[PDB]
Ligand binder design. Structure first.
Ligand SMILES: [Mg+2]
Ligand SMILES: [Mg+2]
Ligand SMILES: [Mg+2]
Ligand SMILES: [Mg+2]
Ligand SMILES: [Mg+2]
Ligand SMILES: [Mg+2]
Ligand SMILES: [Mg+2]
Ligand SMILES: [Mg+2]
Ligand SMILES: [Mg+2]
Ligand SMILES: [Mg+2]
Ligand SMILES: [Mg+2]
Ligand SMILES: [Mg+2]
Ligand SMILES: [Mg+2]
Ligand SMILES: [Mg+2]
Ligand SMILES: [Mg+2]
Ligand SMILES: [Mg+2]
Ligand SMILES: [Mg+2]
Ligand SMILES: [Mg+2]
Ligand SMILES: [Mg+2]
Ligand SMILES: [Mg+2]
Ligand SMILES: [Mg+2]
Ligand SMILES: [Mg+2]
Ligand SMILES: [Mg+2]
Ligand SMILES: [Mg+2]
Ligand SMILES: [Mg+2]
Ligand SMILES: [Mg+2]
Ligand SMILES: [Mg+2]
Ligand SMILES: [Mg+2]
Lengths: 85, 80, 82, 122
RNA sequence: AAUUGAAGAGUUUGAUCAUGGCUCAGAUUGAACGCUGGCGGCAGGCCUAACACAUGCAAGUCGAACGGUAACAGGAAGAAGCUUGCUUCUUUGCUGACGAGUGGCGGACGGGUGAGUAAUGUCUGGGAAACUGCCUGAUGGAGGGGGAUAACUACUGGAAACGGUAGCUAAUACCGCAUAACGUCGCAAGACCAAAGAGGGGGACCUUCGGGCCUCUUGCCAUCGGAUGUGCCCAGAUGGGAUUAGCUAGUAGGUGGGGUAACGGCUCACCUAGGCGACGAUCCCUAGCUGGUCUGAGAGGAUGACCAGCCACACUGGAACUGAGACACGGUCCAGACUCCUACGGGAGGCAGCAGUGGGGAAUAUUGCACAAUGGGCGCAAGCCUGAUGCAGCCAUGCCGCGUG
RNA sequence: CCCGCAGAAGAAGCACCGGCUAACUCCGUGCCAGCAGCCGCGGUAAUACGGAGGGUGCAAGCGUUAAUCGGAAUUACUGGGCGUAAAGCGCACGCAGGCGGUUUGUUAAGUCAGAUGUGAAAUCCCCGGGCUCAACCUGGGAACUGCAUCUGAUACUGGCAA
């Protein structure tokens, strides 16, 4: 409403869409992992982890999941896979 | 220990869901007589070991549950 | 960031500031961390008019506090050692 | 296509929720009201602090009906229910200030211009 | 030196003593009314309808991030007003500057209110599992690329709000790629993550005369600290009622998955059958809590304006997005209630910010001045903004002083 | 804030006067008009109504109303009562609860002691300081009677034992 930082409104949408896509693509690669664990495939399970690890670590750096959120995911996944891998 | 609490058991009958009674005396803030103000606490005790009637020593840990912020330390006495 | 500044506990037309260390975001006369001096600008030439526990001010500026503009003057106006 | 005994919904903030038509105005022996005609109604039920109480008797203009409206090409606009807008007795003119649901252009009636100005649709 | 301070009277009786209510002298007030009314200093000023609101103002700032010229200011090869040094327009963003736009930081502060809340609250005292913008210590970073886009141009729809096509372009916008430890996962071996430039002045030397180069400043990335802010857990205390005695299925606990910055029935699946309760649960009624304020010799009683702390709310219900921080007081979205605009097709708005208005009431102020001070936002700065604030206006409303001899 | 200028020049009101309660007479009125916090005044001499003279009390205020506490030991913890004045349940048995003879040992929760931390600033209070005084402003103390932690003391109370 009439006050300069209308700008801010339209700004936070540009932001919102940006983060929306990277935020999904990320949880996809995360999904691909839990998929293999439910399957049984230890290799695809590691294969999945090794391609998602960078993009999590990476997203965090960029700052839509800042720090430990990544950690937990790695930690969790790692346990799971070699729980029976 | 940074402080500890004693108290009798009161309820053992639940997979580690141990609850302990604590008893203080306190001067009535108005009529000076001393009365019994009781406190019940929900304490953790891995591999269930205390029993109804046991005196027990207890300490304040972080939240183990919505209810539990205390584990036990030692036991004292039984078969009341 | 924390800051050293003048709270104005004066009295219409005869100001008398407390000098305080506080979260710069708070109100000029609101919540503060500790008091570290005072500054009567109507001191009168009689006696006192700008007492100022330096060795604390010190401490906080060590811990990262900025100083006002007025206060900065007072410190460099107390002189410092004499 | 409304007549005596017909219940109607209300398309305004009048406070009336359910009304009954006790008269079809506009001509001796005249049976139906529809389109955008004026009817006399009684109030069967109303909200607790409205502009009108239950039991009140006044007029209203029908603005929505199951039977609808034909247009000069053959088409029809049909509504799922019958709705009217309450008017004051010695003036027609709407008692309410807001209108709800769509209305038809048939209301182009002068005295009902406020009703088109307000109101969401058609 | 520093709470060292306590009084009674009237009235049942013909009279009496007792019992016992009523009344009175005292302090106190954000007060009102009636009569009266001189001046000043400090203070106080919608207690009611968390009723509804016309209009102005209450949050911006940075050209030292970016392409930039539309306004007005100058200057300019050169075209000129010509009254031959005083100077006019074509233009040219050349720099002083600067509407609009991108970007940055602030719009989570400051200011309002007391609705909800008997506890995600508050007060006291503690605890462990966390994040923390600006500011600050330490240690190294800061390579090399890429595709966009607003502005603008053209075309075009609307009364307006504001749009549709197609191009076109810069960066501290954006994304890869490198680099990767005292960081993250991992017992290890290993694997994995980042960034941005912008100014100021300057000797050779010289360059495509823009600059490299030197040099200092400022911003940018990473890790560990500080400082502050905030999240969370426990205990005790913090109104009333039994003409409310039973309450409870995510309910209580466990195991695992998931989740959060973090512990956790936070969530789920499965198991155990628990958990609370007369030391008052549940239900109902009322209520923001504190410091303190008034009174009282005290103990108490009463109270929570003005000042400061915490919480909570921002038309009503609900939501999340952005962000270090919000489920956002002058942000967004949905529903609702209600109001305004209109060319009738569609749009817009929320004073419990300041002033002001209607309404309610026994009753509560000016649509003022200024950033000079202090304090806050942004900027290297100069500065710009700041109804915070500092002042002024109104009322004997109070305190204090003074006068009317 | 300072100096000059004129001329007492512009500047007093409100409640009360029966007792409680400081302050008294006259006229009018006549259970009327009316007053009133409580008692209670008014029917022919009204210090109680209304007016007047006088007086008492406060003063740019004064009265009235509303409101909290006080006096009220009238919810009595400090600090009260129940034969006849308000008040012993018609009587009993008894769960919970409260209380509990006497001895030794032990415990250290109640209790007591010390130390440490904390109890925001303002406010209150004491001693000062600054506005011509005062209100107001300010330095510094004192106080916040509280809470927690640690270590001790064991008479009393609580726990355990006999
Ligand atoms: Mg887990
Ligand atoms: Mg008598
Ligand atoms: Mg008057
Ligand atoms: Mg600009
Ligand atoms: Mg309320
Ligand atoms: Mg960037
Ligand atoms: Mg890399
Ligand atoms: Mg680059
Ligand atoms: Mg779990
Ligand atoms: Mg007393
Ligand atoms: Mg206020
Ligand atoms: Mg909301
Ligand atoms: Mg976020
Ligand atoms: Mg507003
Ligand atoms: Mg206003
Ligand atoms: Mg009125
Ligand atoms: Mg103001
Ligand atoms: Mg006398
Ligand atoms: Mg009288
Ligand atoms: Mg007489
Ligand atoms: Mg009493
Ligand atoms: Mg008695
Ligand atoms: Mg009796
Ligand atoms: Mg008897
Ligand atoms: Mg004995
Ligand atoms: Mg204090
Ligand atoms: Mg003096
Ligand atoms: Mg003993």
């Amino acid at each position: 409403n009439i006050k300069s930082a209308k700008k801010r409104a339209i700004q936070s949408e540009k932001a919102r869409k940006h983060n929306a896509s990277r935020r999904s693509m990320m949880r996809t690669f995360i999904k691909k992992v839990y998929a293999a664990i439910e399957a049984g495939d230890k290799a695809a399970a590691q294969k999945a982890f090794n391609e998602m690890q960078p993009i999590v670590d990476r997203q965090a750096a960029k700052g839509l999941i800042h720090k430990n959120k990544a950690a937990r995911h790695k930690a969790n996944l790692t346990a799971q896979i070699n729980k029976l891998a | 220990k940074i402080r500890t609490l004693q108290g009798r058991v009161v309820s053992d009958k639940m997979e580690k869901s141990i609850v302990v009674a604590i008893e203080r005396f306190v001067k009535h803030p108005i009529y000076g007589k001393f009365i019994k103000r009781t406190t019940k606490l929900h304490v953790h005790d891995e591999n269930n070991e205390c029993g109804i009637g046991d005196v027990v020593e207890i300490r304040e840990c972080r939240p183990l549950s919505k209810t539990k912020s205390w584990t036990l330390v030692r036991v004292v006495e039984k078969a009341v | 960031m924390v800051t050293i500044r003048l709270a104005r506990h004066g009295a219409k037309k005869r100001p008398f500031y407390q000098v305080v260390v506080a979260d710069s975001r708070n109100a000029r006369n609101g919540r503060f961390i500790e008091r570290v001096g005072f500054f009567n600008p109507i001191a009168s030439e009689k006696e006192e008019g700008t007492r100022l526990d330096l060795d604390r001010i010190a401490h906080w500026v060590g811990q990262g506090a900025t100083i006002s503009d007025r206060v900065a003057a007072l410190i460099k106006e107390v002189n410092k050692a004499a | 296509m409304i007549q005596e005994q017909t219940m109607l919904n209300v398309a305004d903030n009048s406070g009336a929720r359910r009304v009954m038509c006790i008269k079809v105005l506009g001509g001796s022996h005249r049976r139906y009201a529809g389109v955008g005609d004026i009817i006399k109604i009684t109030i069967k039920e109303a909200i607790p602090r409205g502009k009108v109480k239950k039991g009140d008797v006044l007029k209203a203009v029908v603005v929505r009906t199951k039977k609808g409206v034909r247009r000069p090409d053959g088409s029809v606009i049909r509504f799922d229910g019958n709705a009217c807008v309450l008017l004051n007795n010695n003036s027609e003119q709407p008692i309410g200030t807001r209108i709800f649901g769509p209305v038809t252009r048939e209301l182009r009636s002068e005295k009902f211009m406020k009703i088109i100005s307000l109101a969401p649709e058609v």
